[PDB]
Amino acid sequence: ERPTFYRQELNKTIWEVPERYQNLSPVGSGAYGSVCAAFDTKTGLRVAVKKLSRPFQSIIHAKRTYRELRLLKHMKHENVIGLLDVFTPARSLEEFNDVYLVTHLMGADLNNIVKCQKLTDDHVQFLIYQILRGLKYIHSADIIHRDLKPSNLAVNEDCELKILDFGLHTDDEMTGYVATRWYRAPEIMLNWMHYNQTVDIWSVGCIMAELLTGRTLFPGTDHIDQLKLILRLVGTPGAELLKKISSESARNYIQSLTQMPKMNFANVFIGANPLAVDLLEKMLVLDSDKRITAAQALAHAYFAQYHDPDDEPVADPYDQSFESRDLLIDEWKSLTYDEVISFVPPP
Ligand SMILES: C[C@H](Cn1ncnn1)Nc1ncc2cc(Oc3ccc(F)cc3F)c(=O)n(C)c2n1
């Protein structure tokens, strides 16, 4: 049956949650809502509870709310954030206005681990292996993260990693000298073309380099500065890639730049494992068609000690036909409500 709910004011709003969740404490903002840490007395777990802010404010908001719930409900993988619970205090569709999402509370993100310092090669292997294992799963369901960065990669004390915020930033927060843009594939940063899953592999390359050196790979001061930093490392595009830039304006800008050859990665990443260098070379390819995939990267010799083809699962089919569907607010809201009430908690 329905649990008993209790009320509490936390992040400028009244949080109404089942009794099972105790000791609620603000821990910052998440995607499209604020997060509280809590103790789940039913499971004995420390949990993160996110209350979405104005989930049904507009069509865009309502569809976004449905999207996140659909994504979280589908993900059942060790290296991907999953849904422990989803609830509403509402007793019917007509009273339904708030959505609460519950997941594992994670101790630290990759920003906290890096802390301006180099990690050991074995630590890099294990961390990057888990990101790729998670990405293989996500990509197998035709989901693209689109915004992988250290701040959405979370880790427990044993360095077991989970990927947060997949499949979901404004122009302002992408402006200037900001970590929000440093990990983005050039094709999405400058809207060169219809992009796909390979954008995420670029992001892994940027993250892996930073784990190895303790420094941001492409810390651009703006979009243009960042492109110049990228092209200095990987070389300016060839005729083959240029043709694929469907944006006439973006392609015309590219051709104005003085040509530069790809640099020697062994001279860039001094002292690094030669196998790490080789992998970086295969991830940080400008033409996205030619980047190593997650499944291929798991088989690369760098992960020899972690790779197990029988323990790198793929996802069940994910129906996202809703993405091309035009609906009214109340219709997105009703779809969302159905998904809330039909939720079954994990083992
Ligand atoms: C490292 C990071 C921050 N932190 N808080 C306490 N200690 N470290 N931990 C953490 N754990 C879980 C989430 C969940 C987050 O979002 C959610 C996603 C899905 C969900 F069901 C519930 C959520 F709260 C989130 O946005 N952040 C930033 C998180 N951070």
mmCIF file of C-alpha atoms and ligand atoms in Angstrom:
data_model
loop_
_atom_site.group_PDB
_atom_site.id
_atom_site.type_symbol
_atom_site.label_atom_id
_atom_site.label_comp_id
_atom_site.label_asym_id
_atom_site.label_seq_id
_atom_site.Cartn_x
_atom_site.Cartn_y
_atom_site.Cartn_z
ATOM 1 C CA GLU A 1 0.000 0.000 0.000
ATOM 2 C CA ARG A 2 0.864 3.719 0.167
ATOM 3 C CA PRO A 3 3.483 4.642 2.794
ATOM 4 C CA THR A 4 2.948 7.491 5.275
ATOM 5 C CA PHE A 5 4.557 10.783 4.209
ATOM 6 C CA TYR A 6 5.936 13.573 6.411
ATOM 7 C CA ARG A 7 6.724 17.230 5.658
ATOM 8 C CA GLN A 8 9.910 19.269 6.073
ATOM 9 C CA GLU A 9 11.274 22.536 4.662
ATOM 10 C CA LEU A 10 14.721 22.103 3.098
ATOM 11 C CA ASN A 11 15.773 23.757 -0.182
ATOM 12 C CA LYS A 12 13.420 26.782 0.040
ATOM 13 C CA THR A 13 10.547 24.309 -0.518
ATOM 14 C CA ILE A 14 8.467 21.787 1.442
ATOM 15 C CA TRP A 15 9.774 18.253 0.919
ATOM 16 C CA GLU A 16 7.153 15.543 1.506
ATOM 17 C CA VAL A 17 8.725 12.064 1.702
ATOM 18 C CA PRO A 18 7.894 8.562 3.027
ATOM 19 C CA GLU A 19 8.812 7.899 6.667
ATOM 20 C CA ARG A 20 11.468 5.392 5.599
ATOM 21 C CA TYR A 21 13.713 8.317 4.599
ATOM 22 C CA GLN A 22 15.232 9.995 7.643
ATOM 23 C CA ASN A 23 17.867 12.656 8.430
ATOM 24 C CA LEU A 24 17.411 14.654 5.209
ATOM 25 C CA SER A 25 20.295 17.058 4.564
ATOM 26 C CA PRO A 26 20.963 19.323 1.505
ATOM 27 C CA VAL A 27 23.987 18.304 -0.607
ATOM 28 C CA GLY A 28 23.647 20.674 -3.583
ATOM 29 C CA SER A 29 21.978 20.828 -6.979
ATOM 30 C CA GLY A 30 21.491 18.119 -9.589
ATOM 31 C CA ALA A 31 20.104 18.135 -13.120
ATOM 32 C CA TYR A 32 16.762 20.014 -13.019
ATOM 33 C CA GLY A 33 16.430 19.845 -9.210
ATOM 34 C CA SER A 34 18.065 19.974 -5.780
ATOM 35 C CA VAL A 35 19.504 16.942 -3.968
ATOM 36 C CA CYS A 36 19.262 15.883 -0.304
ATOM 37 C CA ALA A 37 21.266 13.129 1.367
ATOM 38 C CA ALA A 38 19.184 10.802 3.542
ATOM 39 C CA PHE A 39 19.239 7.528 5.453
ATOM 40 C CA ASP A 40 16.920 4.892 3.987
ATOM 41 C CA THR A 41 15.779 2.875 7.016
ATOM 42 C CA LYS A 42 14.339 0.106 4.811
ATOM 43 C CA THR A 43 17.583 -0.714 2.963
ATOM 44 C CA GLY A 44 20.169 0.693 5.387
ATOM 45 C CA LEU A 45 21.648 2.729 2.520
ATOM 46 C CA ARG A 46 22.737 6.344 2.418
ATOM 47 C CA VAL A 47 20.717 7.775 -0.452
ATOM 48 C CA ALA A 48 20.475 10.878 -2.623
ATOM 49 C CA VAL A 49 16.933 12.222 -3.064
ATOM 50 C CA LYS A 50 16.281 14.716 -5.868
ATOM 51 C CA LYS A 51 13.102 16.790 -5.978
ATOM 52 C CA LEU A 52 12.516 18.160 -9.483
ATOM 53 C CA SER A 53 11.727 21.889 -9.581
ATOM 54 C CA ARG A 54 8.583 22.767 -11.569
ATOM 55 C CA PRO A 55 8.520 19.398 -13.396
ATOM 56 C CA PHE A 56 5.408 20.309 -15.431
ATOM 57 C CA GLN A 57 5.894 24.080 -15.913
ATOM 58 C CA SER A 58 5.844 23.879 -19.729
ATOM 59 C CA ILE A 59 5.894 21.301 -22.545
ATOM 60 C CA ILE A 60 9.722 21.396 -22.481
ATOM 61 C CA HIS A 61 9.785 20.840 -18.692
ATOM 62 C CA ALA A 62 7.132 18.092 -18.761
ATOM 63 C CA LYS A 63 8.895 16.186 -21.572
ATOM 64 C CA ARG A 64 12.242 16.591 -19.779
ATOM 65 C CA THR A 65 10.722 15.142 -16.597
ATOM 66 C CA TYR A 66 9.373 12.146 -18.535
ATOM 67 C CA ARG A 67 12.768 11.722 -20.271
ATOM 68 C CA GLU A 68 14.799 11.620 -17.051
ATOM 69 C CA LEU A 69 12.383 9.196 -15.379
ATOM 70 C CA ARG A 70 12.436 6.922 -18.458
ATOM 71 C CA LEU A 71 16.255 7.011 -18.556
ATOM 72 C CA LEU A 72 16.710 6.290 -14.819
ATOM 73 C CA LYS A 73 14.111 3.475 -14.835
ATOM 74 C CA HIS A 74 15.917 1.730 -17.701
ATOM 75 C CA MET A 75 19.476 1.805 -16.310
ATOM 76 C CA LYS A 76 20.441 -1.386 -14.493
ATOM 77 C CA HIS A 77 24.255 -1.507 -14.524
ATOM 78 C CA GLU A 78 26.956 -1.415 -11.823
ATOM 79 C CA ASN A 79 28.698 1.560 -13.449
ATOM 80 C CA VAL A 80 25.570 3.587 -14.219
ATOM 81 C CA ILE A 81 23.405 5.535 -11.780
ATOM 82 C CA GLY A 82 20.174 3.643 -11.111
ATOM 83 C CA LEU A 83 16.790 4.332 -9.572
ATOM 84 C CA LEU A 84 16.326 2.965 -6.046
ATOM 85 C CA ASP A 85 12.919 4.632 -5.675
ATOM 86 C CA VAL A 86 10.619 7.213 -7.224
ATOM 87 C CA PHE A 87 7.632 8.648 -5.360
ATOM 88 C CA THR A 88 4.959 11.320 -5.227
ATOM 89 C CA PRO A 89 2.790 12.354 -2.242
ATOM 90 C CA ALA A 90 -0.076 12.681 -4.762
ATOM 91 C CA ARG A 91 -2.864 10.082 -4.481
ATOM 92 C CA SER A 92 -4.202 10.603 -8.020
ATOM 93 C CA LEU A 93 -3.209 12.065 -11.403
ATOM 94 C CA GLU A 94 -5.259 15.209 -10.670
ATOM 95 C CA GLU A 95 -3.264 15.995 -7.505
ATOM 96 C CA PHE A 96 0.062 14.913 -9.063
ATOM 97 C CA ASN A 97 2.511 17.836 -9.217
ATOM 98 C CA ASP A 98 5.806 16.736 -7.606
ATOM 99 C CA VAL A 99 8.361 14.030 -8.508
ATOM 100 C CA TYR A 100 11.095 12.704 -6.186
ATOM 101 C CA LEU A 101 13.970 10.530 -7.440
ATOM 102 C CA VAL A 102 16.136 8.363 -5.174
ATOM 103 C CA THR A 103 19.588 6.902 -5.908
ATOM 104 C CA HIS A 104 22.793 5.884 -4.076
ATOM 105 C CA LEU A 105 24.605 8.699 -2.296
ATOM 106 C CA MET A 106 28.147 8.758 -3.667
ATOM 107 C CA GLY A 107 31.114 9.887 -1.565
ATOM 108 C CA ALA A 108 33.199 11.729 -4.153
ATOM 109 C CA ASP A 109 33.389 12.687 -7.821
ATOM 110 C CA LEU A 110 36.442 12.537 -10.133
ATOM 111 C CA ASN A 111 37.161 16.233 -9.474
ATOM 112 C CA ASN A 112 37.640 15.412 -5.779
ATOM 113 C CA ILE A 113 39.960 12.518 -6.667
ATOM 114 C CA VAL A 114 42.158 14.408 -9.201
ATOM 115 C CA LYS A 115 42.843 17.373 -6.839
ATOM 116 C CA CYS A 116 45.559 18.972 -9.068
ATOM 117 C CA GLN A 117 47.613 15.733 -8.847
ATOM 118 C CA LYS A 118 48.581 12.674 -10.917
ATOM 119 C CA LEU A 119 46.992 9.298 -10.173
ATOM 120 C CA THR A 120 48.884 5.992 -10.527
ATOM 121 C CA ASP A 121 48.597 4.107 -13.835
ATOM 122 C CA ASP A 122 46.683 1.217 -12.233
ATOM 123 C CA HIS A 123 44.201 3.720 -10.765
ATOM 124 C CA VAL A 124 43.701 5.238 -14.233
ATOM 125 C CA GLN A 125 43.200 1.762 -15.749
ATOM 126 C CA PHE A 126 40.495 0.827 -13.217
ATOM 127 C CA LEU A 127 38.678 4.183 -13.389
ATOM 128 C CA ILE A 128 38.677 4.468 -17.197
ATOM 129 C CA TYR A 129 37.780 0.762 -17.540
ATOM 130 C CA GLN A 130 34.608 1.307 -15.466
ATOM 131 C CA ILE A 131 33.586 4.420 -17.427
ATOM 132 C CA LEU A 132 33.942 2.439 -20.652
ATOM 133 C CA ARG A 133 32.074 -0.562 -19.212
ATOM 134 C CA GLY A 134 29.223 1.776 -18.250
ATOM 135 C CA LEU A 135 29.366 3.557 -21.622
ATOM 136 C CA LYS A 136 29.214 0.256 -23.555
ATOM 137 C CA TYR A 137 25.918 -0.449 -21.710
ATOM 138 C CA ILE A 138 24.476 3.062 -22.220
ATOM 139 C CA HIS A 139 25.442 3.139 -25.928
ATOM 140 C CA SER A 140 23.990 -0.354 -26.531
ATOM 141 C CA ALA A 141 20.567 1.148 -25.714
ATOM 142 C CA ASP A 142 21.234 3.959 -28.247
ATOM 143 C CA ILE A 143 21.591 6.499 -25.428
ATOM 144 C CA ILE A 144 24.226 9.227 -25.631
ATOM 145 C CA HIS A 145 25.494 10.888 -22.457
ATOM 146 C CA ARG A 146 26.433 14.103 -24.342
ATOM 147 C CA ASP A 147 28.032 15.814 -21.315
ATOM 148 C CA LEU A 148 30.518 13.455 -19.660
ATOM 149 C CA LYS A 149 32.893 15.242 -17.287
ATOM 150 C CA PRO A 150 34.637 14.548 -13.932
ATOM 151 C CA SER A 151 31.732 16.144 -11.991
ATOM 152 C CA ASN A 152 29.221 13.544 -13.227
ATOM 153 C CA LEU A 153 31.505 10.602 -12.518
ATOM 154 C CA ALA A 154 31.078 9.510 -8.903
ATOM 155 C CA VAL A 155 33.065 7.048 -6.830
ATOM 156 C CA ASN A 156 32.795 5.219 -3.482
ATOM 157 C CA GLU A 157 35.697 4.554 -1.066
ATOM 158 C CA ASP A 158 36.787 1.450 -3.043
ATOM 159 C CA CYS A 159 36.945 3.576 -6.234
ATOM 160 C CA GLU A 160 33.890 1.829 -7.695
ATOM 161 C CA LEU A 161 32.487 4.255 -10.263
ATOM 162 C CA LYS A 162 29.021 5.280 -11.488
ATOM 163 C CA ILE A 163 28.026 7.542 -14.395
ATOM 164 C CA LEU A 164 25.520 10.320 -13.591
ATOM 165 C CA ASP A 165 23.298 12.626 -15.739
ATOM 166 C CA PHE A 166 23.259 10.707 -19.073
ATOM 167 C CA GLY A 167 20.908 11.471 -21.962
ATOM 168 C CA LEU A 168 19.748 14.886 -20.801
ATOM 169 C CA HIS A 169 23.420 23.393 -20.479
ATOM 170 C CA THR A 170 22.534 26.924 -21.607
ATOM 171 C CA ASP A 171 24.782 29.123 -23.774
ATOM 172 C CA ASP A 172 25.838 31.239 -20.762
ATOM 173 C CA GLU A 173 27.230 28.367 -18.662
ATOM 174 C CA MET A 174 29.112 27.102 -21.742
ATOM 175 C CA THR A 175 30.795 30.511 -22.141
ATOM 176 C CA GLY A 176 34.428 31.241 -21.278
ATOM 177 C CA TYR A 177 37.014 29.467 -19.147
ATOM 178 C CA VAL A 178 34.687 26.761 -17.798
ATOM 179 C CA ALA A 179 34.913 23.006 -17.098
ATOM 180 C CA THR A 180 31.396 22.721 -18.567
ATOM 181 C CA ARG A 181 32.913 22.929 -22.082
ATOM 182 C CA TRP A 182 36.451 21.482 -21.671
ATOM 183 C CA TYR A 183 35.370 17.853 -22.235
ATOM 184 C CA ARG A 184 33.062 18.423 -25.242
ATOM 185 C CA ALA A 185 33.775 16.933 -28.681
ATOM 186 C CA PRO A 186 34.602 19.681 -31.197
ATOM 187 C CA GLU A 187 31.676 18.623 -33.458
ATOM 188 C CA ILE A 188 29.109 19.328 -30.698
ATOM 189 C CA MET A 189 30.925 22.374 -29.267
ATOM 190 C CA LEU A 190 30.670 24.117 -32.644
ATOM 191 C CA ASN A 191 27.620 22.270 -34.070
ATOM 192 C CA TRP A 192 29.471 20.871 -37.102
ATOM 193 C CA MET A 193 27.099 17.991 -37.855
ATOM 194 C CA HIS A 194 24.425 15.590 -36.632
ATOM 195 C CA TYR A 195 26.404 13.923 -33.833
ATOM 196 C CA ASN A 196 26.255 10.437 -32.303
ATOM 197 C CA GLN A 197 27.614 8.237 -29.452
ATOM 198 C CA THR A 198 31.250 8.877 -30.458
ATOM 199 C CA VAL A 199 31.062 12.316 -28.805
ATOM 200 C CA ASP A 200 31.270 10.504 -25.455
ATOM 201 C CA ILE A 201 34.557 8.778 -26.394
ATOM 202 C CA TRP A 202 36.156 12.184 -27.000
ATOM 203 C CA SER A 203 35.071 13.091 -23.447
ATOM 204 C CA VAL A 204 36.669 9.896 -22.044
ATOM 205 C CA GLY A 205 39.921 10.812 -23.851
ATOM 206 C CA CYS A 206 39.910 14.258 -22.195
ATOM 207 C CA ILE A 207 39.170 12.714 -18.784
ATOM 208 C CA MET A 208 41.805 9.971 -19.144
ATOM 209 C CA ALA A 209 44.512 12.526 -20.072
ATOM 210 C CA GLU A 210 43.613 14.629 -17.026
ATOM 211 C CA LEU A 211 43.833 11.570 -14.733
ATOM 212 C CA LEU A 212 47.269 10.835 -16.189
ATOM 213 C CA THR A 213 48.709 14.375 -15.962
ATOM 214 C CA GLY A 214 46.614 15.980 -13.210
ATOM 215 C CA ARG A 215 45.878 18.834 -15.659
ATOM 216 C CA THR A 216 42.988 19.778 -17.962
ATOM 217 C CA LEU A 217 43.733 18.581 -21.509
ATOM 218 C CA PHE A 218 41.979 21.428 -23.393
ATOM 219 C CA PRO A 219 41.382 24.265 -20.881
ATOM 220 C CA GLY A 220 40.081 26.750 -23.486
ATOM 221 C CA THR A 221 39.228 30.322 -22.446
ATOM 222 C CA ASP A 222 36.329 30.261 -24.956
ATOM 223 C CA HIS A 223 35.030 28.134 -27.884
ATOM 224 C CA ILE A 224 37.661 29.449 -30.355
ATOM 225 C CA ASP A 225 40.628 29.172 -27.969
ATOM 226 C CA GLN A 226 39.531 25.617 -27.133
ATOM 227 C CA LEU A 227 39.320 24.646 -30.817
ATOM 228 C CA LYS A 228 42.855 25.965 -31.356
ATOM 229 C CA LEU A 229 44.121 23.881 -28.399
ATOM 230 C CA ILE A 230 42.402 20.780 -29.813
ATOM 231 C CA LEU A 231 43.724 21.251 -33.370
ATOM 232 C CA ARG A 232 47.267 21.867 -32.121
ATOM 233 C CA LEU A 233 47.242 18.374 -30.576
ATOM 234 C CA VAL A 234 45.240 16.372 -33.124
ATOM 235 C CA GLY A 235 46.003 18.293 -36.329
ATOM 236 C CA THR A 236 43.692 20.397 -38.498
ATOM 237 C CA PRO A 237 40.988 18.456 -40.409
ATOM 238 C CA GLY A 238 41.581 16.792 -43.782
ATOM 239 C CA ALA A 239 39.372 17.025 -46.889
ATOM 240 C CA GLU A 240 37.549 13.859 -45.837
ATOM 241 C CA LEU A 241 36.348 15.301 -42.525
ATOM 242 C CA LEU A 242 35.631 18.748 -44.022
ATOM 243 C CA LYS A 243 33.057 17.233 -46.410
ATOM 244 C CA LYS A 244 31.251 15.788 -43.369
ATOM 245 C CA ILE A 245 30.888 19.209 -41.731
ATOM 246 C CA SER A 246 27.365 19.860 -43.033
ATOM 247 C CA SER A 247 27.455 23.356 -41.542
ATOM 248 C CA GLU A 248 28.665 25.586 -44.397
ATOM 249 C CA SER A 249 29.677 28.399 -42.012
ATOM 250 C CA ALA A 250 31.597 26.148 -39.581
ATOM 251 C CA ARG A 251 33.399 24.430 -42.478
ATOM 252 C CA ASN A 252 34.318 27.826 -43.952
ATOM 253 C CA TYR A 253 35.797 28.952 -40.615
ATOM 254 C CA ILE A 254 37.868 25.742 -40.290
ATOM 255 C CA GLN A 255 39.546 26.279 -43.686
ATOM 256 C CA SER A 256 40.750 29.755 -42.660
ATOM 257 C CA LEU A 257 43.100 28.250 -40.063
ATOM 258 C CA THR A 258 46.755 27.542 -40.843
ATOM 259 C CA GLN A 259 47.219 23.789 -41.234
ATOM 260 C CA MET A 260 48.941 21.869 -38.449
ATOM 261 C CA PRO A 261 50.010 18.230 -38.242
ATOM 262 C CA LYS A 262 48.986 15.859 -35.442
ATOM 263 C CA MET A 263 51.496 16.024 -32.578
ATOM 264 C CA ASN A 264 53.464 13.101 -31.144
ATOM 265 C CA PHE A 265 51.415 11.934 -28.118
ATOM 266 C CA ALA A 266 54.499 10.283 -26.548
ATOM 267 C CA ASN A 267 56.077 13.753 -26.405
ATOM 268 C CA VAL A 268 52.842 15.215 -24.997
ATOM 269 C CA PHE A 269 52.275 12.570 -22.306
ATOM 270 C CA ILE A 270 55.850 12.143 -21.067
ATOM 271 C CA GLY A 271 56.408 9.021 -18.954
ATOM 272 C CA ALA A 272 52.920 7.629 -19.529
ATOM 273 C CA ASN A 273 52.309 3.946 -20.212
ATOM 274 C CA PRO A 274 52.825 3.438 -23.993
ATOM 275 C CA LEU A 275 49.508 1.554 -24.019
ATOM 276 C CA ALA A 276 47.753 4.582 -22.476
ATOM 277 C CA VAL A 277 49.298 6.779 -25.178
ATOM 278 C CA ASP A 278 48.052 4.389 -27.893
ATOM 279 C CA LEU A 279 44.516 4.389 -26.445
ATOM 280 C CA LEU A 280 44.463 8.215 -26.198
ATOM 281 C CA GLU A 281 45.521 8.370 -29.865
ATOM 282 C CA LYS A 282 42.536 6.145 -30.793
ATOM 283 C CA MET A 283 40.016 8.111 -28.672
ATOM 284 C CA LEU A 284 41.154 11.653 -29.532
ATOM 285 C CA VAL A 285 40.591 11.409 -33.280
ATOM 286 C CA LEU A 286 39.016 14.490 -34.833
ATOM 287 C CA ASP A 287 36.804 12.558 -37.290
ATOM 288 C CA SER A 288 34.174 10.946 -35.067
ATOM 289 C CA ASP A 289 33.579 8.121 -37.610
ATOM 290 C CA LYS A 290 37.118 6.934 -36.848
ATOM 291 C CA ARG A 291 37.161 7.055 -33.023
ATOM 292 C CA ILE A 292 37.415 3.796 -31.087
ATOM 293 C CA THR A 293 34.019 2.690 -29.670
ATOM 294 C CA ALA A 294 33.418 1.714 -26.008
ATOM 295 C CA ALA A 295 33.157 -1.992 -26.901
ATOM 296 C CA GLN A 296 36.400 -1.832 -28.920
ATOM 297 C CA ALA A 297 38.222 0.127 -26.179
ATOM 298 C CA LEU A 298 37.353 -2.478 -23.512
ATOM 299 C CA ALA A 299 39.317 -4.969 -25.647
ATOM 300 C CA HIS A 300 42.404 -2.672 -25.856
ATOM 301 C CA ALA A 301 45.576 -4.051 -24.207
ATOM 302 C CA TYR A 302 45.618 -1.196 -21.643
ATOM 303 C CA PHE A 303 42.742 -2.908 -19.769
ATOM 304 C CA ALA A 304 44.159 -6.451 -20.013
ATOM 305 C CA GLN A 305 43.968 -6.929 -16.234
ATOM 306 C CA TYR A 306 40.301 -5.834 -15.970
ATOM 307 C CA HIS A 307 38.752 -6.883 -19.295
ATOM 308 C CA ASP A 308 36.253 -9.744 -19.192
ATOM 309 C CA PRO A 309 34.019 -10.109 -22.308
ATOM 310 C CA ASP A 310 31.547 -12.163 -20.237
ATOM 311 C CA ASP A 311 31.184 -9.483 -17.546
ATOM 312 C CA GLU A 312 30.561 -6.406 -19.734
ATOM 313 C CA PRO A 313 26.785 -6.581 -20.279
ATOM 314 C CA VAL A 314 24.600 -4.761 -22.809
ATOM 315 C CA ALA A 315 21.223 -3.115 -22.145
ATOM 316 C CA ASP A 316 17.679 -4.235 -22.882
ATOM 317 C CA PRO A 317 16.111 -2.345 -25.830
ATOM 318 C CA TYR A 318 15.158 1.240 -24.906
ATOM 319 C CA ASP A 319 12.100 2.651 -26.698
ATOM 320 C CA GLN A 320 12.643 6.381 -27.226
ATOM 321 C CA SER A 321 9.993 6.934 -29.915
ATOM 322 C CA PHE A 322 8.589 9.497 -27.464
ATOM 323 C CA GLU A 323 11.470 11.859 -28.366
ATOM 324 C CA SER A 324 9.905 12.624 -31.760
ATOM 325 C CA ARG A 325 6.359 12.820 -30.362
ATOM 326 C CA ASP A 326 4.448 16.086 -29.899
ATOM 327 C CA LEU A 327 2.192 16.073 -26.825
ATOM 328 C CA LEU A 328 0.425 18.523 -24.498
ATOM 329 C CA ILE A 329 1.583 19.204 -20.917
ATOM 330 C CA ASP A 330 -1.137 17.052 -19.317
ATOM 331 C CA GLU A 331 -0.280 14.186 -21.679
ATOM 332 C CA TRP A 332 3.436 14.209 -20.756
ATOM 333 C CA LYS A 333 2.285 14.528 -17.130
ATOM 334 C CA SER A 334 0.030 11.443 -17.440
ATOM 335 C CA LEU A 335 2.793 9.406 -19.087
ATOM 336 C CA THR A 336 5.085 10.428 -16.213
ATOM 337 C CA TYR A 337 2.449 9.475 -13.602
ATOM 338 C CA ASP A 338 2.058 5.999 -15.156
ATOM 339 C CA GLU A 339 5.834 5.523 -14.916
ATOM 340 C CA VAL A 340 5.924 6.586 -11.236
ATOM 341 C CA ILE A 341 3.142 4.232 -10.113
ATOM 342 C CA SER A 342 4.460 1.241 -12.120
ATOM 343 C CA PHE A 343 7.982 1.440 -10.625
ATOM 344 C CA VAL A 344 9.347 -1.768 -9.067
ATOM 345 C CA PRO A 345 12.311 -1.388 -6.650
ATOM 346 C CA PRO A 346 15.573 -3.262 -7.436
ATOM 347 C CA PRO A 347 16.625 -6.438 -5.503
HETATM 348 C C1 LIG B 1 29.927 12.971 -5.232
HETATM 349 C C2 LIG B 1 28.493 13.476 -5.146
HETATM 350 C C3 LIG B 1 28.354 14.654 -4.171
HETATM 351 N N1 LIG B 1 28.381 14.267 -2.757
HETATM 352 N N2 LIG B 1 27.282 14.421 -1.916
HETATM 353 C C4 LIG B 1 27.718 13.961 -0.715
HETATM 354 N N3 LIG B 1 29.017 13.550 -0.802
HETATM 355 N N4 LIG B 1 29.494 13.738 -2.114
HETATM 356 N N5 LIG B 1 27.583 12.406 -4.723
HETATM 357 C C5 LIG B 1 26.386 12.289 -5.358
HETATM 358 N N6 LIG B 1 25.570 11.204 -5.203
HETATM 359 C C6 LIG B 1 24.390 11.135 -5.856
HETATM 360 C C7 LIG B 1 23.986 12.174 -6.702
HETATM 361 C C8 LIG B 1 22.850 12.141 -7.349
HETATM 362 C C9 LIG B 1 22.457 13.105 -8.143
HETATM 363 O O1 LIG B 1 21.257 13.081 -8.827
HETATM 364 C C10 LIG B 1 20.296 12.101 -8.733
HETATM 365 C C11 LIG B 1 20.047 11.306 -9.849
HETATM 366 C C12 LIG B 1 19.078 10.310 -9.794
HETATM 367 C C13 LIG B 1 18.351 10.121 -8.621
HETATM 368 F F1 LIG B 1 17.421 9.158 -8.573
HETATM 369 C C14 LIG B 1 18.587 10.917 -7.505
HETATM 370 C C15 LIG B 1 19.563 11.912 -7.562
HETATM 371 F F2 LIG B 1 19.789 12.676 -6.479
HETATM 372 C C16 LIG B 1 23.254 14.232 -8.343
HETATM 373 O O2 LIG B 1 22.874 15.146 -9.104
HETATM 374 N N7 LIG B 1 24.488 14.337 -7.671
HETATM 375 C C17 LIG B 1 25.377 15.500 -7.835
HETATM 376 C C18 LIG B 1 24.847 13.267 -6.837
HETATM 377 N N8 LIG B 1 26.018 13.302 -6.169
#
